[PDB]
Amino acid sequence: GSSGSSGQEYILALADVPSSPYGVKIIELSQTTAKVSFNKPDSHGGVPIHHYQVDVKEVASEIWKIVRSHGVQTMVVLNNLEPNTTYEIRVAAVNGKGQGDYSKIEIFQTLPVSGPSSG
Numbered sequence: 831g832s833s834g835s836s837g838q839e840y841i842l843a844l845a846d847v848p849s850s851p852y853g854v855k856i857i858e859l860s861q862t863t864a865k866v867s868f869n870k871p872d873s874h875g876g877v878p879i880h881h882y883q884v885d886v887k888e889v890a891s892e893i894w895k896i897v898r899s900h901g902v903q904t905m906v907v908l909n910n911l912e913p914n915t916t917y918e919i920r921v922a923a924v925n926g927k928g929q930g931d932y933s934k935i936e937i938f939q940t941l942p943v944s945g946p947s948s949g
Contacts, residue, residue, distance in 0.1 A: 845876025847930035848923035851904070854933055861913035861941040867905045868921045868933070879925045882906070886919040889937070914942040 853869035866884065879902055886908055887894045899906050911917060916939040920932040 841876065845927060847875040847927040848879055848925050849873045850931045850933040851882070851921045851923055852933065854921045854936055856938045859938060859941060861943050862909065862911050864908040864911060864917070864938055864940060865905065866908065866919055866921065866936070869904060871923050875925055875927045875930055877926045879923050881924055883922045883924045883929055884919060886917050889916050889918055911940055913940050915940055
């Protein structure tokens with residue numbers, strides 16, 4: 831029939847990448863940080879997702895920053911951002927196969943600095 835390593839290549843070999851996530855929205859937005867909460871993808875690329883790839887950057891800047899999570903969580907907080915500024919973030923599903931597709935580009939604007947003294 832065949833030689834070399836073979837056996838578990840029935841479907842796991844003809845598998846595809848996971849679909850783009852949904853429900854993505856910023857629940858906790860700050861002047862410097864920004865929390866992005868989303869829901870699992872309506873479907874997976876055959877194999878179980880490993881992690882999510884998030885890419886955020888200023889609508890004016892041309893540098894995309896990649897921030898990986900610490901697991902299969904659908905929630906991640908961003909940092910190192912300027913207040914009163916807007917940034918475009920996109921959530922994608924990355925698995926053994928790879929980075930399927932990016933979800934509807936999201937646009938969030940940090941809060942305008944108010945003061946360190948609770949008011």
